[PDB]
Design a protein around this ligand. Sequence first.
Ligand SMILES: N[C@@H](Cc1ccc(O)cc1)C(=O)O
Ligand SMILES: N[C@@H](Cc1ccc(O)cc1)C(=O)O
Lengths: 311, 317
Amino acid sequence: MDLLAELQWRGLVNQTTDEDGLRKLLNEERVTLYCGFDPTADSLHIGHLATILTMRRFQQAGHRPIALVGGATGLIGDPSGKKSERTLNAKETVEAWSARIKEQLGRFLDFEADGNPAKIKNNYDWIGPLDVITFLRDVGKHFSVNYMMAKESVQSRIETGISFTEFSYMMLQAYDFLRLYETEGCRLQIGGSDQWGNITAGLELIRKTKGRAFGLTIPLVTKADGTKFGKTESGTIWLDKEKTSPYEFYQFWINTDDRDVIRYLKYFTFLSKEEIEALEQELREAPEKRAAQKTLAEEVTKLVHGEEALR
Amino acid sequence: MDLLAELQWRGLVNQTTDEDGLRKLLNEERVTLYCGFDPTADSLHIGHLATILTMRRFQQAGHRPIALVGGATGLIGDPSGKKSERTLNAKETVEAWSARIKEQLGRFLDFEADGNPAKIKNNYDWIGPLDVITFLRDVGKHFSVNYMMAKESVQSRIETGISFTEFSYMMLQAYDFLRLYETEGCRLQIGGSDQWGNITAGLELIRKTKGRAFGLTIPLVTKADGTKFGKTESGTIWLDKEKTSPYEFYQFWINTDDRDVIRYLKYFTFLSKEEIEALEQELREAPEKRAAQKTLAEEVTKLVHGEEALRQAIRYA
Ligand SMILES: N[C@@H](Cc1ccc(O)cc1)C(=O)O
Ligand SMILES: N[C@@H](Cc1ccc(O)cc1)C(=O)O
């Protein structure tokens, strides 16, 4: 309501399944939400921040976040937002990564709060042991191939080609949505824009199987200059302080372009509406000063690296 | 070689991937083949005979038949030859059906032979335990959505609607082919016409997985009147002498359409060209003796039920 509006003011809402319905749920109850992360590398990078930070905004508003590490789905591969078929990673490799990603995630959430402690989950737990028979009958039966073919992630690759492995991926994330709803009271799933189709599939699964849940997507981070975000010439800014140092990390933020800066304060910091506007005024009135950028860099660096790393 | 030539002669060959290549293995080796049967009911019916009597003709030629009972594919359902989506049977049921279907295959094959005893298998054994992830990584990666989409069982239902469940069936029958190939030297798979799609998917798996194997299908059983083969007023003709009695059974056969009779002698009996021809002359030459239909009925009744039963059916009839 006020959280949804704020998110909205912050430009963190791309699409929602039912705005009026979610907003009433948010204002009424303590909502249990989830967002999943597939280990595709040994580190999360700045492109995952928006989604994590948003999970934390919800925790600050009193909701209960569940970050999910795709220990199983990571072995399959999401065609979502990918232009070509991907090579399969080794279980041993995906396993190692999971562990690393599980650690990063945990820096952003509160596992001790009362009322809404966070949780970190790995879908390997419930998919790892799923046999083919049960999957096909219990999940598979509820989806038509048509339904499936019309999803962007598949519709996008039909000229290129897609494997049955990657085409099936959405049933898996559909299943995670259903499990978490069943065991955890989860009624909201968040994700990046390309996740829309996987999100609406999970929802269709609960609906055909039960009879009460929502989806919301976060817009991709944009560069006013029309460039690509997190794209340096030292490559990727990782949240792994040994791949990308605090220095390096902090320097990245400080060099944020004036045209981008405020948008970035809104997406990435926990500053108030009122605080951000000040900064806006100061950029107008005294940009040589570069106050907005300096705040951004300290705020983000603290969040990702801690106060010590800030020093 | 000769077995092909005679299958061909009996009109039992509808399609084969590589005749030339197959005729060569048959003539050159003792081929291990398989045919699958899904328990969609407690008993097999006469729609099942052509494939079962063919397995038997192979075994007679000296190859080794493997009949697989669809312990696990029976729980998924094959869209092939079905114009709509089926209801999922329940495990306990399907399993009840498999035990029963396992006993009927057993009478058409020789487990005793020298060189090629028949074997009966149940795919629940390798699929019951398969996990989603191995399934999807190890099998799935090999198949494009395009390849699956061009199948007739799918193309045919894109209108009426097909679940991902029935969509995926072909991966399981393709996996059976591979499994048998690896563990039993199975190089040939047969089935009725509608299995053509499922048979070729099996060979793609193997080819994409190994780098050797064949498929053959038998034509669908027809009636010169264009009505449905094996459909009574009573329903279906079962192979279970407790669903359909020997008498009921026998009667079904003596009653074949004159037009249908020689064709059926070819598909359903172990008589010779020579003999078949005879009965054919008899029928042009004296069709009221109903010569043909009698042999047929006697022949199929003995195969399915034994002479004691034939004795009896001949009696109360
Ligand atoms: N598929 C998503 C992550 C994800 C994994 C599992 C889930 O249940 C939900 C989301 C991605 O590729 O980023
Ligand atoms: N699908 C076949 C039976 C079958 C099952 C498993 C196989 O591996 C092969 C064939 C049918 O419906 O008759």
